[PDB]
Amino acid sequence: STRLQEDVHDIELLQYINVDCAKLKRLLKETAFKFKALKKVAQLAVINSLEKAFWNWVENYPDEFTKLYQIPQTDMAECAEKLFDLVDGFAESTKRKAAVWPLQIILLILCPEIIQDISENNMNKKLFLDSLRKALAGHGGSRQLTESAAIACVKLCKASTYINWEDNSVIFLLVQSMVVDLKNLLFNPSKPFSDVDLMIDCLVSCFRISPHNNQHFKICLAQNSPSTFHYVLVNSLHRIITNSALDWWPKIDAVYCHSVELRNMFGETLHKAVQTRSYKYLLLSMVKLIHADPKLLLCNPRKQGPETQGSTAELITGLVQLVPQSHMPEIAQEAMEALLVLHQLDSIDLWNPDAPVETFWEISSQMLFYICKKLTSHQMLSSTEILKWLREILICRNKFLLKNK
């Protein structure tokens, strides 16, 4: 407050404060009354600090954000209209404008009442929203304007993710106007975007809002020409596997029917594992996903039977080929713990759904002899970590032999 009374870094302190509704009430009141007329860049510091503070509130207390829409609250409406008038008074140049709409979206979402009023104060709101829509159209807009529209849409839909649609029907009435536009500029296969975090968050949110099979999910999935789109896909899938906590329960552990294609994609870059720069990051992200969850690539039976080349066997032979490699340490490092997680009993229940007893000893002897011949080759620099991991593999094998009886 003393900082706000009059090179300003104490504002960013509220970027790191644990806040609730009552704290943002008094904080947003203090930035509302004084409104800091006498500076320019500290206004932007206040603006993006309020952005990160709003996000901190909505992960910390999602129930308050749900009850904001379930029961209307008027102090948020009047304070948000006050700050919207202040922000609209602040920005006239296109740079400051393209800065401020990532807060104008939040400041509009904070009001449940006036979103239906969009469909004296209303004309500025309608004009700025339609200015965002024209930037989404891509024509009649600045180069920084279209990027800011995409940031506005991804933050808007991420705000829309948390609340249920049965709480309010106005949220899909908003976002379904913009889903086709965001898909058009974001997830087209031909033209590159104006990065990767925006597509990851956009993809995660667009199958929060849709439990159906997304055609754009097929676009980034099946042999898309941008390999960065595949990186976005695998990283977003890792976000689904790891980072779900009160997030919307459709589309987790529900994309398993695509799973064998993912293994096929692995096989493609497995050949690119043999012999560029973007290839190894994609490999590292996929093997992080395997270490995070191996049940995705094992729940599909995947032509079980040794007459066909076993897909589980193909994957594990690819991993154990990737283990004793010294051209890159980090990729070989991650597959090591991926294998030792894979050798746990719950993982090897999914190894052979027909009979888990049969092929586990066979493929374990296969990887055992393959790694022991490489250790006999002796031309290693870091074979002691291989020895420790092999010791853990021996522990897991003896545990499964105890369970096998």
Swiss-Prot record:
<protein>
    <recommendedName>
        <fullName>Neurofibromin truncated</fullName>
    </recommendedName>
</protein>
